[PDB]
Design a protein around this ligand. Structure first.
Ligand SMILES: C[C@H]1CCC[C@H](C[C@@H]2Cc3cc(O)cc(O)c3C(=O)O2)O1
Ligand SMILES: C[C@H]1CCC[C@H](C[C@@H]2Cc3cc(O)cc(O)c3C(=O)O2)O1
Ligand SMILES: N[C@@H](CCCC[NH3+])C(=O)O
Ligand SMILES: N[C@@H](CCCC[NH3+])C(=O)O
Ligand SMILES: [Cl-]
Lengths: 482, 471
C-alpha cells in the first residue's frame, strides 16, 4: 500500500521497456465481438458454474480491481459503458503459445485498458465472468486511480475521473442528454423547426471578442430571442433553437457565464398556450424520467432531508404585483418608476431588512422584492409568477385587460427561475427602444404576427431532475480558476 | 413605382389612425382552426366551383398579391372575397389590406370556377401590418443575407435550402444515436485553444482572458477516457481567419469519437453516412451541382460507395515526377518542395514549414482529382498531423483520412493517438492521455459545406441563416 506517486515513474519506464522488447503497448486495433452491456444481456441467465467453452469471444474494458487469489489464478473487475463483469484468469485455460501466463498478467495494473479473448460463464459463486485464453494491453493507465469513494474540486477539473469512479456521475450526465432529447422530440412532434442563429452579433453584461480579419469588435449573444423573432417574420411559424448563451456576471450555484438555453417561438400563440405548454412539458419530462410525477430533491444538500416536488398540473400562478401588495399591506400605485412609489418600495426593502440595489430603478426594486417574498412561496410544487410590469419586461406584449402589466410568465422550482415566456410584442410603435438591433426593429416593421415564445434554462432543469445543488455538477467541464 | 420612404410613413400613419378609431391593428389572439398546408391537404380534392358553405373555418397567413394570395409555412392558397358573402363596409375593409399584411380570415373552403383552391371570407381581420413595400417575386443581392426574413418570404428555394439543412442535421443525429453514440456539450471557452488563430474574450468576474474553441476534439477525447466510448457533439466552432465562399469565422461542426475503432472503420462509416444521407434526401445516389455557378452547366456527383482513396505523398510524388525523401522537414527536401511550388507558378506560404508546403502542393494537384465523385485523401504525414496515430506499417505517415467534394474538404478523421509519450496543448488533456486512452477512431464534419453541396449553393453564406456581415 501507499505507493509514493512513483507509479508514473515505474509505468512510464515499463512502457519504454515494452517498446525495447519489440512489444507495442498501445496497439492500433482490437476486433471485438461484443460490448460489456451486451455481454451481460446475453449471458445474465447462465447457471452458477456453467461455462460455454465452445464460445470464443473478444471483449474490451478498463481494469478497475486487480484481485489475485492463488499464483496460477487471478481476478479482475472489468468495466465498460457504465457496467462491470468479473474476469477469472486461469493458468490452466491460458493459451501458452502466445505468452507466459505469469508475465502476461503480472503486467496488468488497475486502470489499464485491456482486450480479452475468452469464453463466457459463471463462477461457482454465481458471478458472471469472462475466461481469458489471452489478454492484450491496449492502453495503459500510468497513474494511480482514486479508490471507490475516493471523491472534491478534482471532479470538475478532471471529469473523466468522476465518470470512471462515481456511478452517479455517469447517471447525472446521461440524464442531461435524455432531457434534451425528450425536449427535442417534444418540440419536433408539435411541428417546430430547429435552426441555428449567430453566436456573435454587433450588439445582461456581454462577453466581447474581436474578429481579426474584420477589424470589428463583436459580442457573444446573451440570448437567442431576437433572431428567432426575425425568423417568425420569415414565415417559419414554429421555430426553436437549443444552445449556448453567454452572460458576463457572477458565478455561483445557479450561474455559469456560459449555459445551455432553449428558446422556441410559436406564431399565433397567446400566453395561455405557453402555460398549457409548460405544464404539459414539465410533467411529461418528469413522468418520462421517473414514471411518477413526484420526485425528491435535497434542497439543503445531501446531508439534509430531501423535499418532494410535485409536477402534477396544473401549477399555481401568482400575480407578482398583487402578491407583493397583498403581502406587504401596501398599494403600489402606477406608474412604478413614479417618484412616490419608488420610495414606497425602498422604504419596504430596508424596513424588512433586505439588500438595496444600486441603481435603485423601479425595475430592479420589484425584482428584489419579488425574490424575497414571492419566489419561495412554494418549494413542494413548481409554480408560475405571471403578469410582470412593462418596465420589467420590454419585449413582453401589454396585457390585454390589465393596464401597466404584460402577459408574461415565469416558472419557478424551489426558489429558482427555469422558464421565462410571454405573448411577444409585435407592434413596432409600442417598442420603446425602437422609437435593440437596427435589424430586429426593422423586421418588426415588416410585420410580426401574434406570437408567443418561451425560454428554458437547460441546466437548472437538469439540476433539479438530477438532485444537484450546484449547476457545476450538471455541466461536464465547467469554467474553473487555474 | 412608389418611394419606400413615404410608404412607411403613410402606413405608420394608417396604424395610428386605426388606434384613434378604437380599432386594434395588432390584436392579441386569433383562434385558428387550421394551418394552410392542412387546408390544402383536406380540400385538395374538391370539384371546380364547389363550395362547402356550411363549413366555417378560421385561417391565417401573409398577404402576398392583390389582384388575394395568402401564404403560410411555405405554401399558398387563393382568397376570393365576395360582396355575396361578406358579413356587413366591404370596400373599406379590404381597400385597407396591403401586400405583406398578415391577416386572419373567417371563411369557407372551396374552388373557383377555374379550379383554384381558395378560402372565402365572411370576415378578414388585420393581425400584423406590413409597414414597408416588399420585393417583387424575382427581385432578390446582399439583402438576402442581412435580412433573411425577406429571402424566406419571397424565394421558395430559400426555405427549401434551410429545411434541408435541418434535415441533414437530424439525419446525422439519428445516424449517430442509432449506432449508440452519446451526445454531449463541451466548453465554448477554454484556457488554451486544429491549427488556427483564435477568437479571444475576457471573463469579468473571473478576471481572465479565455479562448473560443477552434474545435471540439480535445474534451471529447478526455471523455473517451471518462468511459463514454461513443461520444459526439454537434455545434459551433470559431476560427479567426479568412472569409470566403467556403469559410466563416464561426461554423457548425460535428465530431464523434469512437472507442475501439480503427481508421478503416471510419472509412466504412463515412461511405455509409454520406451515401445514405444523399439517398435519404433525393432518393438517388447521384446529385447535380452547379460548380461554376448557376449561369453554367451543372455537374453530376455520384455518392455510390466505395469512394476512391488517394495517398497524399504518393500522389504529389507521382504527379511531379519527384521523390520526396523523408524526413520531410529535412533541408534537402523542403527546397525540393519550394522548387516545385514556384516552378508550377503557385503561391508560397510564410513560414515555409514542410507541413504547410505539403498542404499547398496537395491543394493544387490532388484536391481536384475527382469532382464527379467524393473521394478520400489518406495517410498524411505525422508532421502535418499531430494528433493522428502513427500508421501501423508505413513509417512517417499517419492513419488519417479526408473526404473531398468538388475540391473542398468536408470530413477529417483518423485513428487517434493515445500514447502520451509520442505526443510532441492543454496540461489537462495531456494528463488524461496518461490515465489511459484506448484505441479510438474519431471524425469531424463540416456541416455547412456538406449542406452547401446538397443544396446546390456556391456560397457558404447561402446555407447559414444570418451570416456575419460588415455593416
Ligand atoms: C434563457 C433563460 C430562460 C429562463 C431560465 C434561465 C434563467 C437563468 C439565466 C441564467 C443566467 C446566468 O447568468 C447564469 C445562469 O446559469 C442562468 C440559468 O441557468 O438560468 O435562462
Ligand atoms: C470540422 C471540420 C472538418 C473538416 C471539414 C471542415 C473544414 C472547414 C473548417 C473551417 C475553418 C474555417 O476557418 C472556416 C470555415 O468555414 C470552415 C469550414 O466550415 O470548413 O470542418
Ligand atoms: N430571451 C428570454 C427567453 C425568451 C422569452 C420569451 N420571448 C430570456 O433569456 O429570458
Ligand atoms: N479536430 C478535427 C476533427 C476531428 C478529427 C479526428 N479527431 C478538425 O477540426 O479537423
Ligand atoms: Cl491497414
Amino acid at each position: 500500500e501507499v505507493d509514493p506517486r512513483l507509479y508514473f515513474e515505474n509505468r512510464s519506464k515499463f512502457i519504454q521497456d515494452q517498446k525495447d522488447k519489440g512489444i507495442n503497448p498501445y496497439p492500433h486495433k482490437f476486433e471485438r465481438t461484443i460490448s460489456i452491456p451486451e455481454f451481460i444481456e446475453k449471458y445474465k441467465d447462465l447457471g452458477n458454474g456453467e461455462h460455454l467453452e465452445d464460445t470464443i469471444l473478444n471483449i474490451t474494458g478498463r481494469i478497475m480491481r486487480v484481485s489475485a487469489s492463488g499464483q496460477k489464478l487471478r481476478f479482475f473487475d472489468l468495466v465498460g459503458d457504465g457496467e462491470k463483469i468479473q474476469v477469472l484468469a486461469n493458468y490452466s485455460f491460458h493459451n501458452h503459445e502466445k505468452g507466459n501466463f505469469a508475465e502476461c498478467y503480472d503486467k496488468i495494473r488497475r486502470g489499464d485498458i485491456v482486450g480479452i479473448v475468452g469464453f463466457p460463464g459463471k463462477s461457482k459463486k454465481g458471478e458472471l465472468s469472462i475466461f481469458p485464453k489471452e489478454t492484450i494491453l491496449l492502453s495503459a493507465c500510468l497513474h494511480m486511480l482514486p479508490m471507490k469513494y475516493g471523491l472534491t474540486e478534482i471532479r470538475y477539473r478532471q471529469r473523466y475521473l468522476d465518470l470512471l469512479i462515481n456511478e452517479s456521475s455517469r447517471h447525472t450526465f446521461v440524464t442531461r442528454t435524455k432531457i434534451i432529447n425528450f425536449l427535442r422530440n417534444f418540440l419536433n412532434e408539435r411541428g417546430f423547426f430547429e435552426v441555428e442563429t449567430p453566436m456573435m452579433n454587433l450588439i445582461a453584461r456581454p462577453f466581447i471578442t474581436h474578429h481579426n480579419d474584420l477589424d470589428l469588435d463583436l459580442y457573444l449573444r446573451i440570448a437567442t430571442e431576437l433572431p428567432l423573432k426575425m425568423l417568425i417574420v420569415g414565415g417559419i411559424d414554429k421555430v426553436y433553437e437549443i444552445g449556448k448563451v453567454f452572460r458576463n456576471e457572477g458565478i455561483d450555484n445557479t450561474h455559469n457565464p456560459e449555459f445551455t438555453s432553449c428558446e422556441f417561438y410559436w406564431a399565433y400563440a397567446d400566453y395561455n398556450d405557453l402555460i398549457k405548454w409548460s405544464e404539459d412539458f414539465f410533467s411529461q419530462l418528469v413522468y418520462h424520467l421517473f414514471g411518477t410525477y413526484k420526485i425528491s430533491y435535497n434542497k439543503d444538500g445531501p446531508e439534509n432531508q430531501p423535499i418532494e416536488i410535485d409536477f402534477t398540473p396544473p401549477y399555481p400562478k401568482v400575480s407578482i404585483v398583487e402578491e407583493i401588495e397583498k403581502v406587504t399591506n401596501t398599494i403600489l400605485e402606477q406608474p412604478f418608476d413614479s417618484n412616490e412609489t419608488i420610495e414606497k418600495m425602498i422604504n419596504i426593502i430596508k424596513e424588512h431588512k433586505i439588500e438595496l440595489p444600486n441603481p435603485p430603478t423601479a425595475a430592479k426594486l420589484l425584482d428584489q422584492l419579488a425574490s424575497h417574498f414571492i419566489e419561495n412561496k412554494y418549494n413542494d410544487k413548481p409554480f408560475f409568477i405571471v403578469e410582470h410590469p412593462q418596465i420589467m419586461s420590454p419585449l413582453a406584449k401589454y396585457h390585454r385587460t390589465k393596464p401597466g402589466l404584460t402577459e408574461r410568465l415565469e416558472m419557478f422550482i424551489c426558489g429558482k427561475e427555469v422558464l421565462n415566456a410571454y405573448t411577444e410584442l409585435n407592434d413596432p410603435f409600442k417598442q420603446k427602444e425602437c422609437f435593440l438591433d437596427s435589424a430586429f426593429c426593422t423586421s418588426l416593421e415588416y410585420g410580426l404576427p401574434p406570437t408567443g415564445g418561451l425560454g428554458l434554462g437547460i441546466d437548472r432543469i437538469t439540476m433539479f431532475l438530477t438532485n444537484k445543488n450546484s449547476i457545476k455538477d450538471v455541466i461536464l467541464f465547467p469554467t474553473m480558476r487555474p
